[PDB]
Amino acid sequence: CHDQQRLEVIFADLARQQRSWALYEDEGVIRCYLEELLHILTDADPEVCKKMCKRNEFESVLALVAYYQMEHRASLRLLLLKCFGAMCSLDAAIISTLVSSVLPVELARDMQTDTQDHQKLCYSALILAMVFSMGEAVPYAHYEHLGTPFAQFLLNIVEDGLPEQLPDLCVNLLLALNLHLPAADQNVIMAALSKHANVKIFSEKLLLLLNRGDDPVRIFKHEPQPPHSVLKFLQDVFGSPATAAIFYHTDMMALIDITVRHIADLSPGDKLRMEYLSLMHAIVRTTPYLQHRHRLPDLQAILRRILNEEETSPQCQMDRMIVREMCKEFLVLGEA
Known part of the structure; x- marks a missing residue:
């Protein structure tokens, strides 16, 4: 009962011209509030925390967002980001509330305006990847600051960097942002890639991720689990020859090696x-694969093997449907 009462006190004080009461308090005072808040959200009973966060249409959550917009002190913003992170860990509905809020816009703008603060920059990229990690749609107005120019901003960091951990965080954010976009032709991220500005290191990092098979976006255990962000991203990349061109021939071969191996090993x-x-289907469609035919015999062999599987699982049925679609559009893929 103590943890709930403390949450009630902290939330009320922070939510208290309609400027926040916290803004006129000493930094050390608010820091203690935020440290305690982070502690409770992390160590106390999740149900108690979720109850307080969800109360009155996520009132406390949205109030904390409104306070973040007004707070100018970087040390407090850092703690607030950690609290937002703890909240995301609690419940997917809190994530839904956050990503629908102004918070993603605020973080994106802060990243581009206060770039010199490396630590806050990293945590901003982290929280942004967290709130987009469920792959749900966002308000259309978000694309004003979370669109193609923002994606280009992220790509620049991945390639150039600032005067070690930030490039990977920006890669994860690009993957997370792309999750909800259900159209590769209406994709703000793909549009940025089509500009062909600073995509060298980015493409290499995509290959490394696919090689290990990990999904750096999937941090929480919430349902419904979105598709593999790396696989989804690469599918979008090879939805168009304009974006497929980010890979050199040798990179393509490496990508083909990895994909064929995974299809076989799984x-x-x-x-x-x-x-x-x-x-693999998208690669054949948007690249001159049939002119160099890297790993083609190996590809043909396993495609046939999959078709001859006696498995009746809906996934396997889905597997055979895809293979048949591939071989119909490209007959040579079905040959022995």
Whole structure:
């Protein structure tokens, strides 16, 4: 009961011209509030925390966002970011509330305006990746600051960097932002890539991620689990020849090596196999694959193997549907 009462006190004080009461308090006072808030959200009973956060249409959550907009002191913003992170860990509905709020816009603008603050920059990129990690749609007005120019801003950091950890965080954010975009032709991120500005290091990092197979965006355990962000991203990249061109020929071969290996190594029934198959299909469509035919014999062999599988699982049925679509559009893929 103590943790709930403390949450009630902290939330009320911070939510208290309609400027925040916190803004006229000493920095050390608010810091203690935020340290305690972070502690409770992390160590106390999740149900108690979720209850307080969700109360009155996520009133406390949105109030904390409004306070962040007004708070000018970087040390307090840092703590607030950590609290937002703890909140995201609690419940997907809190994430839904945050990503629908002005908060993603605020973070994106702060990243581009206060770039010299490296620590706050990193945590901003982290929280942004967190709130977009569920792959749900966002208000259209968000694309004003979370659109193609913002994506280009992120790409520049990945390639050039600032005068070690930030480039990876920006990669994860690009992957997270792309999750909810259900159209590769209406994609603000793909549009940035098509500009072909600073995509060298980015493409290499994509290859490394696919090689290890990890999904750096999937941090929480919330349902519904979105698709593999790396596979989804690469599928979007090979949705158009304009974006497929970010890979040199040798990079393409490496990508083909990885994809074919995964299709083969994955067990029948694995949900991931249809992702790789869909990726390979897109590669054949938007690259001159059939003119160099890297790993083509190996590709032909396993495509046939998958078709001859006796598995009746819906994933396997989906696998065979994709393979048949590939071989119909490209007959040579079906040959022995």
